[PDB]
Design a protein around this ligand. Structure first.
Ligand code: VIP
Lengths: 237, 300
């Protein structure tokens, strides 16, 4: 069934599972033509496939050449996503293959189900959570590798850096979703919070700064302030 | 013209023969139905006055034997049986015909309704869907489940309709996932028509039989099958033109005959709105769209 607040610790048990977010697969800019009509120009996108227990992120980069000569691109994007997720699962050793795949948007259910018919024992699930994974392209290193790609490419990351050395998966996921919600609601402010202090750096092999435990509590508090605020600045409260 | 005699009518019952029906009182001197048109399958069906639960009945073709109905007080139902003694049967029918103890199949000369509803329905195919090989006629009732329903529990008592499943390996060619899911022509023309049914006449026969079991017995799995077979055609971009024209006629007469007060449970809103207004064939069912819009505009 659908994933929601009730069954939230299920994400951190020992059954392998992946989230799939297709938001950033088909990305366009909209512009005027010389005749004054409107046109789109595609830019590189990505599939965001995340193991919430381990932090392993399979970032499949979607190069604009995929769309050349195709029609109904927003529909094709869902099927391309499902094809690539299916190919990823098939590439993994049997003992690494997920038991469930949770899609962040219900329109991915039928494309993924049809692509995964060969895997009847892998459950394809929606969620009632409104997860902020679209903001993944606000993470500078992720945006950089997507925009620089000249061909289709899969890049592997750990979106938790080394956090699991000190905190549980539950806490790591909560931190991630807080950071991404912040970046989604007010990217500039969120990014200022994360980099304001020049002495805390991002290691070459990491995505986020090297905060101490104490500094993460301060950071997390600042992100919560931001989100509640913008929720005022938005709804005037 | 053929006859289905009745030994007696010991319990009060509403008896249907095809699209007609009449009430028989407990122990009324009723001895059967005469003047049944030759050339068509027929269904004779029963709803007891005490227990409207379980409509049940029998599909038969009078060219295949002499059939009669007798009430079984142990099993509590009207049973069809075959009479092997042709001289005894002719004598039994003549005596009752002389005593005017039979209702006449009440067909209006102008009226092609039953033909139009059963055009492609053959007894031999019915007998493969309803497996009881020792009899020439087939029993169906409101509660029988379909083979596909049993996969999702007595197999001898099932409706073995052809399984249709749009999210299945049979329906979806590896490497054509999107193509085959959004345009079901492969599954319609290659898998089902060329492979399983062999021609469109057998496809339409099963479609018509499913509808008739849905309408006459309220059989839910039959209704599911009817809608699935419609949806498979309408969701195919490539369908032989003669098939589309024939489907429009078939569905027109089905919608025309449907009791208005049962449209709520016998018509699937999603399938019909998709078929008539969104599918590849949205513009190919003129007669059916016109009667649906004038008889059931609420559903749409
Ligand atoms: C009563 C009886 N079982 C035997 O005469 C019967 C009734 C009607 C038609 C028949 O062939 C047989």
């Amino acid at each position: 069934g659908a994933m929601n607040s009730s069954n939230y610790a299920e994400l951190f048990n020992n059954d392998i599972k992946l989230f799939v977010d297709d938001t950033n697969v088909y990305r366009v800019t909209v512009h005027k033509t010389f005749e004054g009509n409107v046109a789109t120009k595609a830019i590189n996108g990505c599939i965001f496939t995340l193991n919430p227990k381990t932090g392993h992120l399979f970032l499949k980069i979607i190069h604009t050449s995929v769309w050349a000569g195709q029609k109904r691109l927003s529909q094709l994007a869902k099927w391309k996503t499902a094809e690539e997720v299916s190919a990823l699962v098939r590439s993994l050793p049997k003992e690494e293959q997920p038991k469930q795949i949770i899609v962040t948007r219900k329109a991915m259910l039928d494309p993924l189900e049809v692509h995964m018919l060969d895997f009847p024992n892998i459950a394809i699930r929606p969620t009632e959570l409104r997860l902020p994974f679209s903001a993944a392209m606000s993470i500078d290193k992720l945006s950089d590798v997507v925009m620089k790609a000249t061909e289709p490419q899969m890049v592997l990351f750990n979106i938790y850096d080394d956090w699991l050395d000190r905190i549980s998966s539950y806490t790591a996921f909560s931190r991630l979703t807080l950071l991404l919600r912040a970046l989604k609601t007010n990217e500039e402010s969120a990014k200022m919070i994360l980099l304001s202090d020049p002495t805390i750096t991002i290691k070459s092999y990491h995505l986020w700064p090297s905060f101490t435990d104490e500094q993460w509590i301060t950071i997390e508090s600042q992100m919560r302030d931001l989100i509640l605020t913008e929720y005022g600045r938005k709804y005037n409260v | 013209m053929n006859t289905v005699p009745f030994t007696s009518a010991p319990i009060e019952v509403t008896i249907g023969i095809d699209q007609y029906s009449f009430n028989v009182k407990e122990n009324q001197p009723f001895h059967g139905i005469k003047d049944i048109p030759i050339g068509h399958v027929h269904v004779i069906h029963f709803q007891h006055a005490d227990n409207s639960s379980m409509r049940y009945g029998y599909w038969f073709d009078c060219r295949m034997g002499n059939f009669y109905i007798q009430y079984d007080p142990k099993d509590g139902l009207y049973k069809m049986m075959e009479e092997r003694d042709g001289a005894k049967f002719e004598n039994i029918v003549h005596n009752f015909k002389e005593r005017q103890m039979m209702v006449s199949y009440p067909k209006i000369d102008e009226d092609d309704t039953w033909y139009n509803l059963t055009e492609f329905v053959q007894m031999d195919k019915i007998r493969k869907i309803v497996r009881k090989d020792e009899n020439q006629f087939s029993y169906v009732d409101s509660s029988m489940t379909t083979v596909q329903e049993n996969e999702l529990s007595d197999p001898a008592h099932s409706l073995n309709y052809t399984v249709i499943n749009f999210k299945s390996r049979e329906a979806i060619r590896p490497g054509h996932e999107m193509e085959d899911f959004l345009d079901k022509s492969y599954y319609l023309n290659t898998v089902m028509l060329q492979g399983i049914f062999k021609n469109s006449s057998n496809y339409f026969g099963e479609l018509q039989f499913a509808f008739l079991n849905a309408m006459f017995f309220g059989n839910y799995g039959s209704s599911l099958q009817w809608h699935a077979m419609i949806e498979l055609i309408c969701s195919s971009a490539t369908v032989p033109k003669h098939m589309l024209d024939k489907l429009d006629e078939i569905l027109y007469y089905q919608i025309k005959t449907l009791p208005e007060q049962y449209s709520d449970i016998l018509l699937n809103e999603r399938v019909w709105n998709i078929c008539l207004y969104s599918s590849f064939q949205k513009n190919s069912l003129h007669n059916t769209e016109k009667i649906m819009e004038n008889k059931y505009p609420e559903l749409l």
